[PDB]
RNA sequence: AUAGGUUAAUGAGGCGAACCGGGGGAACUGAAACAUCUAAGUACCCCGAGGAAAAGAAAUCAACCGAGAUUCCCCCAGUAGCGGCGAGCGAACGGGGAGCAGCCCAGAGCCUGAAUCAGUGUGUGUGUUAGUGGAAGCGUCUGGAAAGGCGCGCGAUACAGGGUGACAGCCCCGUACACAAAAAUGCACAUGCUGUGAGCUCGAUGAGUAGGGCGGGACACGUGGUAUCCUGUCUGAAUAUGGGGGGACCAUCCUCCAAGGCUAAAUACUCCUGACUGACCGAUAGUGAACCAGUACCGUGAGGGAAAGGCGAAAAGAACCCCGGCGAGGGGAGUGAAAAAGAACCUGAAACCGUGUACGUACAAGCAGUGGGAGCACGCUUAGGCGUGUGACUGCGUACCUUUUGUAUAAUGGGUCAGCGACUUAUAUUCUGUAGCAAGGUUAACCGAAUAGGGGAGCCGAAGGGAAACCGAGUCUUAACUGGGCGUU
C-alpha cells in the first residue's frame, strides 16, 4: 500500500526504487537487477493481471 | 572589407539576330 | 482526412457477398425502339464488373 | 537484460529510402521512370480518370434507392439469444445484450445456427427454420 | 421657441502579439480547357471588444416512447444527401463524455429600501513582489592543474543543476527540508460608505412583426418536388376558442410559444512574467540577429537586408637586447603544460602557391591510364629477377553526367575545393510481414491511483439475395422455372 518512510528512503539511492501495486511498469520489471514485492503486493499484482 | 557590391547587368547588350 | 468515396461510383456498384460488385448494364435508357427484344431482355439483369476494371472500381469506392 | 531484447523476425521490414546512389538499387530516378507525368513532385491523376475517355462509372447508369427503413432493422442469429439474458427475447432487450443497436425497431431470427436453453421470443419475425430449431429445443415463439 | 454662442463638470482620442465578434471580400488554382462549380467566406482591408469573445434558458428535437439552455470532445459517417450528379461539397437523428444555472423588463398597489450586482474603504486569510538556515573528505598516484585511479571514512527527506587548473553527494553556489514581509498588491471571504433594487397581492405577455410577392444571401442542400433561416423591395395577419414547427402540401396527432434582454463553467489565444522539460539545432546549423542586427549596406520611398563566435587554467598579453625609417616586419630574451597557444591566436582538412631531395624528360605526336617492363635511387634479404619511389621502351586505350534509335562527339552540365542541397510528415484506406486473442476482436473521447486500471458509445466480423417492401441458407428473376444470376464450403 505503500508507506511514507519507505519513499523518502531510496529517493536518493540510486539503483532502488520503491513503487506501490499499481506502479508496475515493464521496463522496471526487467530495469532492475531483482524485484523485491511484498507477498501483500503479489495477491494484488495477481488479481491485477488476472 | 567594405567590398560588396555587384550591380550586374543585363547580358552586356550589341548585335546579334542570327538570320532567321 | 479520410478518403472520400468519389461519388459518382457509389451510385453505380454494389459491392457483392464474395467481394465482387455487379452493375446494370449500359445501353437501356432511351432509343429503345430499334434495338431487339433479344438485347434489352438481357440487358435487364445486373452483371458483374469485370476482372479489367475492378482496380478502378475499388479506387473509387474506398468504404464500399 | 534490457539489451537482450529483440523483435520477431521479419517482423520489421527496413522500408524503401530511395534517391541514394547507383548500389542502393532506387537512385537517380528513384523508380519513377524517365519524364512524364506520373514522375515530377504530386504527379499522378485522380482516381477514376483512364485518360479523356468516359470513365467506367460514367459510362455506367445509376440504379440506387436506399431504404431508409432498412437502416433500422437489424437481423439476429440464433447463436445470441442464449446470451440475452432472461430467457426472453424481446423487441429490445437484445438491444440491451448490445446485439441490435438502438435505431433499431424491427428483426428477424434468422436460421444462423446453434440454439439450446429453452428461450420464448416474443414481437420478432423468425425463419421458418429458426422457429423449427427454436421450438425443437423447448422454445416458444408467441407474436 | 428653437438654432447659434461662452463657461463648467465628466468621459473619449493613441499604442499593442495572438485568440474573438462584426462590416466588406479576391485571384492564382482544381475541373486535366472553360463560364456553372472550386479555391472560399480563405488571403486581404475595415470596425469593435473582452480576459476570454461568441453562443444560451426551446415558438428545440423526437415520433405516440421520450428528451429538456449554450458551449467543447468522441461517435453517428465520408453514411443520408448535394453536385456541369463532373471536379468536388457533406449533415442530422440518436449514443458516449467535459462542464452544468438560471434570471430579469414589457407595472402598479402595499410594504420599502429588505435579496443581489458593481464601484469602493477597512479587516482577515491566502498567493505575489527582497529574503533565512540548510548535512557530510581525507590519504595517496599521474599531472602545469585532480573533481580522475586506488584506499578508507562520512551525509542523504539533500545523487536537481552550475562552477571550480581534467570527470566533485562531503571546495563553492545550491538541492531536499524547515522558515521570513516593514510596505504594495492578485484572489477569496467579512463588513463600512456610495449607487442599486428585494418582498407579497393583483395584473401584463414583445405588429410594420408572422406570413406572402419580387431580388439575393444563408442553411451539407447549386430552385430542385425544397421545407427552414436572413432581408433590399412592395405588402401584411391571428392574439389562447390564439399562434409556430414536425423538409412540397393537406388531415389527424404530437410538440413548442417568435416578433425585449441578462447570464458562470467546460472552449480559444500568448506581446509578456516564473519555474521546469526535450531520441530539437550547435556558428552555411539554430532566430535575419550566439557578436552594440533590423545594424553596415541598397533604395526617392514603401521596402529589402548581410557578413562577423573560441589565446590561456590564469594576461602570467612578451621587461630588456639586435636589424630597420624613434617604421612595417623579424630574431633573441622572458611568461606558460604548450609561443609549433603571440593576439592575422583551440583543432587547422581541401582547392591553391613555394623551397628541398630521388627518379624521368630537349627525334618526339592524341582521355595521359592500364598489361608488360629495363635503368636509377633506396631499403631488404645473406644473395636469390624482393619492398618503396621513379617509369626509358612497349601492347591496348576517344573523360563523367544527362538525354537519346544512337554520343569521343563539334549535343547538355560542371574552373577547382570545402560545407550545405532533393521521396518527408499527418490522417484515412488496402495489401504483405509479425504479434495478441478468436467466432469473436477492439475500444473513442473521458475518468485516472495518469504508459496501469476504468470507460464497449462505437467499429470490424460471424448471412446472403433483392432497386425496395421483404425473404433468409437461401434469395432474385418470371405466371412458373427443366432454369439462370448473386450467395451457402
Ligand atoms: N550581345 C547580346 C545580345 C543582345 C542583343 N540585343 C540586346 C539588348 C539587350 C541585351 C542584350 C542584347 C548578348 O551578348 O547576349
Ligand atoms: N540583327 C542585326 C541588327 C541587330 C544588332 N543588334 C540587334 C538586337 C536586336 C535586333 C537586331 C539587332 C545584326 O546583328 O547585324
Ligand atoms: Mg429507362
Ligand atoms: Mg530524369
Ligand atoms: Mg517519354
Ligand atoms: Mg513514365
Ligand atoms: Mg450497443
Ligand atoms: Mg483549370
Ligand atoms: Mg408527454
Ligand atoms: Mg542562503
Ligand atoms: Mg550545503
Ligand atoms: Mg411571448
Ligand atoms: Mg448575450
Ligand atoms: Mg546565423
Ligand atoms: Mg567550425
Ligand atoms: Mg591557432
Ligand atoms: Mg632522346
Ligand atoms: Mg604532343
Ligand atoms: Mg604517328
Ligand atoms: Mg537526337
Ligand atoms: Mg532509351
Ligand atoms: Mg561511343
Ligand atoms: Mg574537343
Ligand atoms: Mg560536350
Known amino acids: 500500500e505503500l508507506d511514507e518512510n519507505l519513499f523518502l528512503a531510496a529517493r536518493n539511492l540510486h539503483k532502488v526504487d520503491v513503487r506501490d501495486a499499481t506502479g508496475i511498469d515493464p521496463v522496471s520489471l ?3 537487477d531483482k524485484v523485491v514485492m511484498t507477498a501483500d503486493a503479489v495477491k494484488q499484482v495477481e488479481e491485477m493481471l488476472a | ?15 546579334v539576330d542570327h538570320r532567321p | 482526412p479520410k478518403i472520400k468515396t468519389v461519388r459518382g461510383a457509389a451510385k453505380r456498384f454494389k459491392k457483392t457477398g464474395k467481394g465482387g460488385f455487379k452493375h446494370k448494364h449500359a445501353n437501356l435508357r432511351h432509343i429503345l425502339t430499334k434495338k431487339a427484344t433479344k438485347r434489352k431482355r438481357h440487358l435487364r439483369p445486373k452483371a458483374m464488373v469485370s476482372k479489367g476494371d475492378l482496380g478502378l472500381v475499388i479506387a473509387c469506392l474506398p468504404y464500399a | 537484460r534490457l539489451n537482450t531484447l ?6 520489421k521490414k527496413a522500408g524503401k529510402r530511395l534517391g541514394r546512389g547507383i548500389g542502393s538499387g532506387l537512385g537517380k530516378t528513384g523508380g519513377r521512370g524517365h519524364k512524364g507525368q506520373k514522375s515530377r513532385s504530386g504527379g499522378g491523376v485522380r482516381r477514376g480518370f483512364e485518360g479523356g475517355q468516359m470513365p467506367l462509372y460514367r459510362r455506367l447508369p ?6 431508409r427503413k432498412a437502416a433500422i432493422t437489424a437481423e439476429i442469429r440464433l447463436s445470441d439469444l442464449a446470451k440475452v439474458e432472461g430467457g426472453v427475447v424481446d423487441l429490445n432487450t437484445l438491444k440491451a445484450a448490445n446485439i441490435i443497436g ?9 436460421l444462423a445456427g446453434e440454439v439450446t ?7 420478432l419475425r423468425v425463419t421458418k427454420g429458426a422457429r423449427a ?5 423447448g422454445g416458444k415463439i408467441e407474436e
Open chain 4, 117 to 123: 436453453t429453452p428461450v420464448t421470443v416474443r414481437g
Open chain 4, 6 to 11: 529483440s523483435p520477431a523476425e521479419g517482423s
Open chain 4, 62 to 67: 445509376k440504379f440506387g434507392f436506399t431504404s
Open chain 4, 133 to 137: 430449431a427454436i421450438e425443437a429445443a
Open chain 4, 102 to 110: 438502438i435505431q433499431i425497431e424491427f428483426a428477424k431470427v434468422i
Open chain 2, 1 to 15: 572589407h567594405i567590398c560588396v557590391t555587384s550591380k550586374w547587368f543585363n547580358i552586356d547588350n550589341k548585335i
Open chain 1, 30 to 32: 526487467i530495469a532492475f
